[PDB]
Structure 1
Amino acid sequence: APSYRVKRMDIAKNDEECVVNAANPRGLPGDGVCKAVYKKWPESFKNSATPVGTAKTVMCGTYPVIHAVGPNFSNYSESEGDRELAAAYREVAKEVTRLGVNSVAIPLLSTGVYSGGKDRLTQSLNHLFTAMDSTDADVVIYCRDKEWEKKISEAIQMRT
């Protein structure tokens, strides 16, 4: 049975068959999540650049890194940001399905430096669910904050 789980830990140390990078459209290392990811899979950043609201897979050996570019809400309107955030997760689902993986490590896109200083846990997570509910891979969501871990854990529990 495909499940959702949540783990408070560095996504760069995931035990899934592929990772989603919370990427910038330029395909740059940046800092935060994208740093950890650049350090663990640096050859995955060869031609990783992809537009806002899209996902691009680059192999590190045989290990797929999915660069998903959620919107920077500093730059977008709430309604355009929402559209772009939904579509990035949609692209993740397509890439996970194309890759035929049994599991995927995924961060909550647009909830850090790209949040525009707003709490978007529920917005980002719901878009993740909408997208990934149609796939048959185990989904492990990575966060750093305990409060976020619990709230994510509850949102998972209350769908079953």
Structure 2
Amino acid sequence: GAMAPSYRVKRMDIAKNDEECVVNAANPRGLPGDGVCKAVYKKWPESFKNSATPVGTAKTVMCGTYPVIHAVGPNFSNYTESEGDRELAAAYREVAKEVTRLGVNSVAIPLLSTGVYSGGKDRLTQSLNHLFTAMDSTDADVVIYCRDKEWEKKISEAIQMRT
């Protein structure tokens, strides 16, 4: 565990993270995909051997000894708001199980279903709150990666609000 488990946010490419493992915003087919998933594929392509897993699940594949937790958020283009909300919360619960099982002291994590799976809606608060619901009972340091300057501020505010 971390001595004083924290949440932090950084605005940069999660492929450059300084944590003991990474969460991929994966597709269910284990394809290279786009956005975070493509960055992860370029940095850790070995981790896509048999990474395919259903929506709402996480499957970890090692790249060397570096764990890549492939977490499949729902595509809100395809799901109802109700069903997509349930699967998004479920994917984060599976991430917390994997982080715990791996025994890491830190994890780099993107906000699932906030990019091309968002159905064109702003889901920062929805996705971040499901992240907190899942990760709050873990003792790993969590570092959230984003790319948008306004999202960095909003994520940082939500972290600081609870301290």
Is the structural similarity TM-score above 0.5?
yes
C-alpha displacement of 1:11: 0.1
Q: For 1:73 and 1:32, how far apart are their aligned partners in 2?
A: 16
Deviating above 6 A after TM superposition, structure 1's stretches of 4 or more consecutive aligned residues are none
Q: For 2:74 and 2:34, how far apart are their aligned partners in 1?
A: 16
C-alpha displacement of 1:84: 0.1
Q: For 2:60 and 2:143, how far apart are their aligned partners in 1?
A: 18
C-alpha displacement of 1:46: 0.1
SS of corresponding position for 1:118:
coil
Q: For 1:72 and 1:98, how far apart are their aligned partners in 2?
A: 27
Q: For 2:62 and 2:147, how far apart are their aligned partners in 1?
A: 26
SS of corresponding position for 1:104:
strand
Q: For 1:115 and 1:82, how far apart are their aligned partners in 2?
A: 11
C-alpha displacement of 1:153: 0.1
Deviation string 1:29-69 (CA, Å, 9 cap, x unpaired) is 01111111000000000000000000000000000000000
Q: For 2:49 and 2:70, how far apart are their aligned partners in 1?
A: 11
Q: For 1:72 and 1:30, how far apart are their aligned partners in 2?
A: 13
Q: For 1:72 and 1:38, how far apart are their aligned partners in 2?
A: 19
Aligned pair count? 160
Q: Unmatched 5+ residue regions in structure 2?
A: none
| Match runs of 1:17-32 below 5 Å | 17-32=20-35
Deviation string 1:83-118 (CA, Å, 9 cap, x unpaired) is 000000000000000000000000000000000000
Q: For 1:124 and 1:32, how far apart are their aligned partners in 2?
A: 17
SS of corresponding position for 1:140:
strand
Deviation string 1:132-159 (CA, Å, 9 cap, x unpaired) is 0000000000000000000000000000
Q: For 1:88 and 1:35, how far apart are their aligned partners in 2?
A: 19
Q: For 1:134 and 1:21, how far apart are their aligned partners in 2?
A: 21
Q: For 1:90 and 1:41, how far apart are their aligned partners in 2?
A: 23
Moved more, 91-100 or 29-38: 29-38
Query: TM-score scaled to structure 2, two decimals?
Result: 0.98
Identity of aligned residues (%): 99
